[PDB]
Design an enzyme around this catalytic site. Structure first.
Site, PDB file in Angstrom:
ATOM      1  N   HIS A  41       0.773  -1.237   0.000  1.00  7.19           N
ATOM      2  CA  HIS A  41       0.000   0.000   0.000  1.00  7.19           C
ATOM      3  C   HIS A  41       0.819   1.311   0.000  1.00  7.19           C
ATOM      4  CE1 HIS A  41       0.134   0.518   4.508  1.00  7.19           C
ATOM      5  NE2 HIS A  41      -0.278   1.743   4.245  1.00  7.19           N
ATOM      6  N   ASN A  57      18.015  11.932  11.336  1.00  4.44           N
ATOM      7  CA  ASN A  57      17.262  13.156  11.606  1.00  4.44           C
ATOM      8  C   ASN A  57      16.965  13.831  10.280  1.00  4.44           C
ATOM      9  OD1 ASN A  57      16.088  15.480  12.621  1.00  4.44           O
ATOM     10  ND2 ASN A  57      18.043  16.492  12.991  1.00  4.44           N
ATOM     11  N   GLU A  60      18.371  17.330   9.237  1.00  5.62           N
ATOM     12  CA  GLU A  60      19.796  17.452   8.940  1.00  5.62           C
ATOM     13  C   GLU A  60      20.361  16.325   8.075  1.00  5.62           C
ATOM     14  OE1 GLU A  60      21.142  18.622  13.148  1.00  5.62           O
ATOM     15  OE2 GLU A  60      19.054  19.190  12.768  1.00  5.62           O
ATOM     16  N   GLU A  62      22.550  13.624   7.437  1.00 11.72           N
ATOM     17  CA  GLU A  62      23.456  12.655   8.044  1.00 11.72           C
ATOM     18  C   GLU A  62      24.382  12.071   6.976  1.00 11.72           C
ATOM     19  OE1 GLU A  62      20.389  13.084   9.989  1.00 11.72           O
ATOM     20  OE2 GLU A  62      22.077  14.000  11.049  1.00 11.72           O
ATOM     21  N   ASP A  89      -0.396  -7.242   2.006  1.00 15.83           N
ATOM     22  CA  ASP A  89       0.166  -5.899   1.999  1.00 15.83           C
ATOM     23  C   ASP A  89       1.694  -5.953   2.190  1.00 15.83           C
ATOM     24  OD1 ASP A  89       0.440  -3.121   2.134  1.00 15.83           O
ATOM     25  OD2 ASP A  89      -0.377  -2.936   4.148  1.00 15.83           O
ATOM     26  N   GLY A 183       2.398   6.902   8.409  1.00 18.35           N
ATOM     27  CA  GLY A 183       3.786   7.227   8.126  1.00 18.35           C
ATOM     28  C   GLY A 183       4.662   6.279   8.923  1.00 18.35           C
ATOM     29  N   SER A 185       4.057   2.615   7.779  1.00 13.98           N
ATOM     30  CA  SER A 185       3.793   1.453   6.946  1.00 13.98           C
ATOM     31  C   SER A 185       5.038   0.996   6.228  1.00 13.98           C
ATOM     32  CB  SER A 185       2.730   1.795   5.917  1.00 13.98           C
ATOM     33  OG  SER A 185       1.516   2.137   6.556  1.00 13.98           O
ATOM     34  N   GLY A 186       5.159  -0.306   6.019  1.00 16.43           N
ATOM     35  CA  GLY A 186       6.327  -0.821   5.336  1.00 16.43           C
ATOM     36  C   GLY A 186       7.538  -0.879   6.245  1.00 16.43           C
TER      37      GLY A 186
END
Lengths: 235, 146
Positions: A41, A57, A60, A62, A89, A183, A185-186
């Site tokens: 999905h 982060n 910034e 990395e 899924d 935010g 998922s997966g």
């Protein structure tokens, strides 16, 4: 991740950030140098996805970050033709250029069918992901993790009106407070057995987030682990 | 022996004192220093090594103690005397990763892609600088998150 805690950089060498239309819309987990894994999905028709290995982060840059571009997105054959969009899924993303494996870019272990279930029912697992920190309140700027207790069928089935298929399982705190949110998922759901850490289900969905009576429901990797095995073969 | 003429006044040399005639434990201890290592130099020396005529069979390694003794069985054998065969259900078959019965009744271990089976036939050692599933920052160089 709602009610979780901030992860230490390098603590999750397989945790991948998936940027696409709008960015940070999904996470993923490195199966190996070329192919990452995520939930079906997340594959929006016609968008270009860039895996962001080694990210930490978001505010910034990395030095560990290693972006790649998806050239192929193979969702599970019997994903969703026009039915429950969270059954199988799961999907595999084939990065164009191999990632550079290192302390910050390391794959997760894929157990066979048997052992994956075995490690699932051990009780607890780590779920890491960049996403809503509050149930629809803000997204994760710095990688967050949470430890979530496997919740039995009998209870799962009752909390949801939705037919909890075999393909999936429940996991989360009985009271309202901590869980994965939009935010995420997966992302991964890993269970470490004495140092080595294995994959036990992809993080799929959930009615809202952090509210009692509800539990996050994840994809039973045990079911397709073999598919993954054959799908990511190098030689 | 402590019987010549001023032989305490010399640094102990347990080559000398102990298995000439036969030494005391103190004689043996000031000369050994680490006294873990003395406790076992020890249980082998005399009191009838309970490890008498090796009890643990099936290649088991018997390890005697002051009073008792136990048994290290390598692989494919369970039970205090390695009499019982290891079956994949009692304590993972002794394998550190995956074990399956086959071709007979004894176990057979394995490891996930990236790791290889150690010489003991039960442990897993990497076979790629970056094996699957290991938090690398904590380990490097040879530390742990305390």
């Amino acid at each position: 991740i709602v009610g979780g805690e901030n992860a230490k950089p390098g603590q999750f060498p397989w945790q991948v950030l998936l940027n696409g239309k709008i960015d940070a819309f999904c996470g993923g987990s490195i199966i190996n140098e070329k192919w990452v894994v995520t939930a079906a999905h997340c594959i929006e028709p016609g968008v270009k996805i860039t895996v962001v290995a080694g990210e930490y982060n978001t505010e910034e840059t990395e030095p560990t970050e290693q972006r790649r571009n998806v050239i192929r997105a193979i969702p599970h054959h019997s994903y969703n033709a026009t039915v429950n969009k969270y059954s199988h899924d799961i999907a595999l993303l084939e990065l164009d250029e191999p990632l550079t494996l290192n302390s910050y870019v390391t794959p997760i272990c894929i157990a066979d069918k048997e052992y994956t279930n075995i490690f699932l029912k051990f009780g607890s697992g780590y779920v890491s992901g960049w996403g809503r920190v509050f149930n629809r309140g803000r997204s994760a700027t710095i990688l967050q993790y949470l430890k979530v207790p496997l919740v039995d069928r009998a209870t799962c089935l009752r909390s949801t009106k939705f037919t909890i298929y075999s393909n999936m399982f429940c996991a989360g705190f009985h009271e309202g407070g901590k869980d994965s949110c939009q935010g995420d998922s997966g992302g991964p759901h890993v269970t470490e057995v004495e140092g080595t850490s294995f994959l036990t289900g992809i993080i799929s969905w959930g009615e809202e987030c952090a509210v009692k009576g509800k539990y996050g429901i994840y994809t039973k990797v045990s079911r397709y682990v073999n598919w993954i095995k054959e799908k990511t073969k190098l030689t | 022996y402590n019987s010549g003429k001023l032989e305490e006044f010399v640094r102990g040399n347990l080559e000398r004192e102990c298995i000439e005639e036969k030494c005391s434990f103190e004689e043996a201890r000031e000369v050994f220093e680490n006294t873990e290592k003395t406790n076992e130099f020890w249980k082998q020396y005399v009191d009838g090594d309970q490890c008498e005529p090796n009890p643990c069979l099936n290649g088991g390694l018997c390890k005697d103690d002051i009073n008792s003794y136990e048994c290290w069985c390598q692989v494919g054998f369970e039970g205090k005397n390695c009499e019982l065969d290891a079956t994949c259900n009692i304590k993972n078959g002794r394998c550190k990763q995956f074990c399956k019965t086959g071709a007979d009744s004894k176990v057979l271990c394995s490891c996930t892609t990236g790791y290889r089976l150690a010489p003991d036939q039960k442990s897993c050692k990497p076979a790629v600088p970056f094996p699957c599933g290991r938090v690398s920052v904590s380990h490097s160089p040879t530390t742990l998150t305390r």
